[PDB]
């Protein structure tokens, strides 16, 4: 089977959440592929299916639990399994579709949504932008419940909001220690609050950065990447040097050229 990472919200602390995200990261990459100090995720083309996913099992304030499946090539969530059923976002190509059929194989019920995991559809399904969807311990606990009772009937809107919560707190937290940081702070000071423009813009640009960083001149971007501060103030990124404490993982965009010695 696939590697499994566990985490409970009930007694979750800053140490528990940090241990959780630090372990998820360690499963996503060897890695053993590092460029400008940032680890790269394995290349999708030719990834053997036995190495293609990781499993994240989430426990509620009640014992009820849900197991999430994350695509190793981009750390994104591809679907989940409530105990008796398995749900999957609509893949965008055949090879992807084939790959998920190796997930939760012993389950009895097997569904594939008529939509993908991209934030736009999830936002229209939830009725709210992630800008307007609180995150933190409370929201995650609350989310991982509606993900169980969906197989038993909690309509789509409330379900979509739960994905939005989980993806940011897990998929994005692994991608960005900055996003991991903000989650860690919401737990330390025990607050629930939506993400600010720095988190949202970081999410939107994780692929744009992965291209820039891997296609940079010794870390110099061929063109600047626009981001936003916590106050919504825009600013341009010209160099890998400043993202090193911000981003933790990149999607493989190309082979690593020979190093420029001397």
């Amino acid at each position, epitope marked *: 089977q696939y590697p499994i990472i566990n985490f409970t919200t009930a007694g979750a602390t800053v140490q528990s959440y940090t241990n959780f995200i630090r372990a998820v990261r360690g499963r996503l990459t060897t890695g053993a592929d590092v460029r400008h100090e940032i680890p790269v995720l394995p290349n999708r083309v030719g990834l053997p299916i036995n190495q293609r996913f990781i499993l994240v099992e989430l426990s509620n304030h009640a014992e009820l639990s849900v197991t999430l499946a994350l695509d190793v090539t981009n750390a994104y969530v591809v679907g989940y399994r409530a105990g008796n059923s398995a749900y999957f976002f609509h893949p965008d190509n055949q090879e992807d579709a084939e790959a998920i059929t190796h997930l939760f194989t012993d389950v009895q019920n097997r569904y*594939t949504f*008529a939509f993908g995991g991209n934030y736009d559809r999830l936002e229209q399904l939830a009725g709210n932008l992630r800008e307007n969807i609180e995150l933190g311990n409370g929201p995650l606990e609350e989310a991982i419940s509606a993900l169980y009772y969906y197989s038993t009937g909690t309509q789509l809107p409330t379900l979509a909001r739960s994905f939005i919560i989980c993806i940011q707190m897990i998929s994005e937290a692994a991608r960005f220690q900055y996003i991991e940081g903000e989650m860690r702070t919401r737990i330390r000071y025990n607050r629930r609050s939506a993400p600010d423009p720095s988190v949202i813009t970081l999410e939107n640009s994780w692929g744009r950065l992965s291209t820039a960083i891997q296609e940079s001149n010794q870390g110099a971007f061929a063109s600047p990447i626009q981001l936003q501060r916590r106050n919504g103030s825009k600013f341009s990124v010209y160099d890998v040097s400043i993202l090193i404490p911000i981003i933790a993982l990149m999607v493989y965009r190309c082979a690593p050229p020979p190093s420029s010695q001397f």
Partner: nanobody
Amino acid sequence: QLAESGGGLVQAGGSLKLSCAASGRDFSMYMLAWFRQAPGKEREFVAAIMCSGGGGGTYYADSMQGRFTISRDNAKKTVALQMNSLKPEDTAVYYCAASTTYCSATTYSSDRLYDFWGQGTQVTVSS
């Protein structure tokens, strides 16, 4: 909004064809199915087709399998039901069903999974 057309009248053992034309960009991601009600019987699952990204497998009920065939034209946003060697049992009103929530499901046969329904069209088989 499912627009169903093409019933008809046929001497037993012949052929007809029903078509359903949808209007929606995400049409390619829909689980699609046909249901029929024969008078005296309740509404009955007939056939289903999975979205391309959901395997795309086609499924039929045993009493209709072989004789019938379901297909979609994603470019034309149309579904088809080609019926061959029609028995008089096959005289019924037929419906299209589309799942906007679902691409593929082990429980496809359930009418509960489908959100949109074409207007029933009459198939008559004489002998």
